[PDB]
Amino acid sequence: ATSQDILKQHAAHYESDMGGLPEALVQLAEYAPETFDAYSRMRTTMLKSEADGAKLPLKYKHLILVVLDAIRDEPIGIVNHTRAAMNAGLSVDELIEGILLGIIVYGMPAWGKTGRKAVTFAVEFEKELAGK
Amino acid sequence: TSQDILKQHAAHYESDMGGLPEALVQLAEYAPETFDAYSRMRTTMLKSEADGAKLPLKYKHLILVVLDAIRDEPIGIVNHTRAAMNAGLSVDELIEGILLGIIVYGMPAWGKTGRKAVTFAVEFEKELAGKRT
Amino acid sequence: TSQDILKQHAAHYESDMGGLPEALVQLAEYAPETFDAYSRMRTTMLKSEADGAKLPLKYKHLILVVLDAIRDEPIGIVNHTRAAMNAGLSVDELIEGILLGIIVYGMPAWGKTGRKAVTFAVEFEKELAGKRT
Amino acid sequence: ATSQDILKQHAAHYESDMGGLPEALVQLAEYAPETFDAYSRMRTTMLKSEADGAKLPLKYKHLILVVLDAIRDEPIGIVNHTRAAMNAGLSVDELIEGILLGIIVYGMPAWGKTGRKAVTFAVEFEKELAGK
Amino acid sequence: ATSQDILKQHAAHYESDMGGLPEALVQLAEYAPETFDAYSRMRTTMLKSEADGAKLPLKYKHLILVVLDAIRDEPIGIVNHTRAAMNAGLSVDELIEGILLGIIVYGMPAWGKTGRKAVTFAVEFEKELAGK
Amino acid sequence: ATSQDILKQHAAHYESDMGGLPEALVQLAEYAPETFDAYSRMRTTMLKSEADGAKLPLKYKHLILVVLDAIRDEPIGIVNHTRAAMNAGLSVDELIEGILLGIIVYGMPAWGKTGRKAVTFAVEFEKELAGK
């Protein structure tokens, strides 16, 4: 696998799943293409859709990532995973219910620092989806 | 006392968790007003679909499983796995959810605590099948 | 609605914090039952000595300052510094408390967020002196 | 400062403050005496008593360390700092009030995993102190 | 089955690099063979030796992972990575100097809870390597 | 005052090792001069050069701190330590190989949030060092 081959190999996965290649992963491809390749393989199996044989719905896969990005304080990822979840059918109500659970294990900052940024995005994106 | 507050929330914990975890027993003893407010918060957060929740209870507990994986809380991770599976989560779904922790939190998201949920789940799946029609 | 639950806890937040932080405003909007239970928990935890608490309120908020230092919550760290100092904490005590984070959490316990509390405190000490006899 | 000199120099501080040299710090002295020296200097200023010019009471210094050790999941440290706090005048009621605050910022595990172990110890140590 | 093929595929890597497959990864291979495969590919490139074209010496790659396992409190990993680092030429002195640096960023617990366990192991393994 | 004496006392260390005193430590010196003193003593031994008797090369000491600053999300520190590592002989290739290892223990955010910022800096600083 050449690094051209690697970037092309994963293009459809990121476009489909995320609507694009996140900036972190662009830079990973740039400076660590073999790591990008292996990571992207892992990501592709982990985020497989139901149509492709997964048992956990894709909207709930990305909800889990939302919550994890809340905990880790990843405001870019959290919005990207919210968009992906909602594109896979997640409601804004489900999003909020999921994010709140983070308070049990990680305290009010699970909402207050980054988690709530997903909700702010969600209420605007919900309007856009409704317009489609 | 603590006795009345425990009585208030006993139905929630039996339904949701099959009982009150020891940490929360201790919290009830030493901080009964905190235990009461916390239990009220928990009760709303873990509301079932039948009581009007939008996110299925099995997935609520799966989120808690993954969070307990991250936090390295092995008692909680098994308690929430049990709860999730009681509410219909499959072992396959459990595994799929837990793996996602590796993306954000690395291999220890599986290796330290997450995998203990799976070890439990494989046995609990057979237990649950042997108790139900 | 959210309106009634906000009314319920407004006296607590004005007294304790000088108002409701934006994160909790948002929580009240989107999760009013969670905001209510959480506010009840907070109210007991941050009880004053006058209402029967044993740990002085200034030290309660100092603990929250140090925790916000660890967690890197800069809005919260200033809010709790303000609260602590309103309740009588000195800038010297603030600094002594914050430093202890370095033992358990390394130099970032000061360098990232903790020191922002001190920067604020030096100015707030003069503000508080200019508003009081 | 020889490594003999270093260990002797800090002996009174650890005996006074902690009732002993914690095992982690024994090993630090063993394998990293210059780091042990500098660290112990830092610790000695940070945990200075009121009699020696500190403004924050020693019992509340060690309470802050209790809470931090709850968060970090340091069950040895948490008991050592609880003992130190209580020896400096902290009540079991104050201890519990302080530990609970950890739930706000770090969730129920702030109590459930390690924090509550301080309380379990405290209720037994309180009996011992009362016996003195 | 497919697990057994994938285990075979990565056995050379783990044998060479670690001397075995840690239990966590044995379980991963069983329950999530496609994740184990991709992860192992990723690890294989990350931990490439100088002889295979790496620029960072293998002993220092494993030293970095020792320090990371100290921070994360991975006591099995920390020993596995210490053993790997020393088989790759790392001295005990180097090991201690690197682990200490954790204290700057993560406080005394970077030593006290798991990091120092690597030193305890190292001092014994050194005697083993010295016995030839 | 005593701050100014203690700053003078440690200036040689910081100038040599880091090329300056980070703002966080300037403030520490101002508000907590005795802590700054002891901390600086600790840092001075920890980051001793081979010429002064250290066994772990300075470039690798700073590489370890780069990785730790990636995990902790210290973007000022990560650049300061990258600069220090490269002034001590570390290559950009080595820097990237080490930062990637964070992903094993701490997930993609070990790269995505702060670690990759070191690479961005490094690639520019390399051009500077190459200009002599």
Automatic annotation (TrEMBL), chains A, D, E, F:
InterPro entries according to UniProt: AhpD-like (IPR029032), CMD-like (IPR003779)
Organism (species): Paraburkholderia xenovorans (strain LB400)
Residues of the Carboxymuconolactone decarboxylase-like domain: 33-111
Molecular functions per Gene Ontology: peroxiredoxin activity
Protein name listed in UniProt: Carboxymuconolactone decarboxylase
UniProt xrefs under Pfam families: CMD
Gene3D superfamilies: AhpD-like
Alphabetized SUPFAM superfamilies for the sequence: AhpD-like
Origin organism lineage: Bacteria, Pseudomonadati, Pseudomonadota, Betaproteobacteria, Burkholderiales
TrEMBL record, chains B, C:
Pfam family, one: CMD
Coiled-coil stretches noted in the UniProt entry, renumbered to this chain: none
Residue intervals of the Carboxymuconolactone decarboxylase-like domain: 32-110
Signal peptide per UniProt: none
A molecular function GO annotation: peroxiredoxin activity
Name by which UniProt lists this protein: Carboxymuconolactone decarboxylase
